[PDB]
C-alpha cells in the first residue's frame, strides 16, 4: 500500500479546505502560535482546525560536516485548514504578522489535495 495514498485518503476524510497564507521570514512558527492563541481565545475552533509549516531535513555542510538541518520547503507560507467564513476570514486576516490570503486574482483559492500530499509526506 502506498503511504501517499493513505495520507490522501485521510485528508479526503478530514473536513474543511486548505488555504495558503503569506507571512514573514523567521515568523512562521510565531504566526502559527498567534493563530492558535487567537482562535482559542475567540472560540472559533469550529472554523479553523489545523496549522502546519512544512519542513525538510537538508544536509547543511558546515565546512564539509553534514548535519540534517530543518529548512522550510516553502519559505514565508503557512497552510491552514478551515471553512472560509466572514468571521474566520477577518480573524485570520487580522492576525498580527499575517500578510494576507494568497490566491489567484483577489479572492483566496484552495489548494488541491494532490499538492498538499506532495508537501506533507516525510522526505527530510
Amino acid at each position: 500500500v502506498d503511504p501517499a495514498a493513505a495520507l490522501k485518503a485521510e485528508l479526503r476524510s478530514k473536513p474543511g479546505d486548505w488555504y495558503v497564507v503569506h507571512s514573514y521570514a523567521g515568523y512562521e512558527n510565531k504566526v502559527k502560535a498567534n493563530l492558535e492563541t487567537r482562535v482559542q481565545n475567540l472560540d472559533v475552533g469550529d472554523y479553523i482546525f489545523q496549522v502546519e509549516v512544512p519542513t525538510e531535513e537538508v544536509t547543511e555542510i558546515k565546512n564539509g560536516q553534514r548535519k540534517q538541518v530543518n529548512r522550510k520547503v516553502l519559505p514565508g507560507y503557512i497552510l491552514v485548514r478551515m471553512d472560509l467564513t466572514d468571521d474566520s476570514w477577518a480573524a485570520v486576516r487580522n492576525t498580527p504578522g499575517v500578510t494576507g490570503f494568497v490566491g489567484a486574482t483577489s479572492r483566496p483559492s484552495a489548494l488541491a489535495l494532490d499538492d498538499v500530499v506532495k508537501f506533507l509526506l516525510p522526505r527530510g
Binding site: 520547503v73 516553502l74 507560507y77
Partner: protein, 48 residues
C-alpha cells in the same frame, strides 16, 4: 537594490525548480517584477 533583485530571483528559481503550486510561483513573480521596478525607478508606483 541589486541585492534585493538577486535574492528574489534566486528564491523564485529555487521555488520553480521544486515544482510548487502555480499560485505560489505567481506570487513570487509578482514580487520579482516589483523589485525590478523599484530598482529602475523608485517611487513611480506604490510606496518608495
Amino acid at each position: 537594490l541589486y541585492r534585493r533583485v538577486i535574492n528574489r530571483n534566486n528564491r523564485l528559481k529555487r521555488l520553480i525548480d521544486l515544482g510548487a503550486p502555480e499560485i505560489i510561483v505567481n506570487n513570487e513573480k509578482r514580487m520579482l517584477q516589483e523589485s525590478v521596478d523599484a530598482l529602475f525607478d523608485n517611487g513611480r508606483r506604490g510606496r518608495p
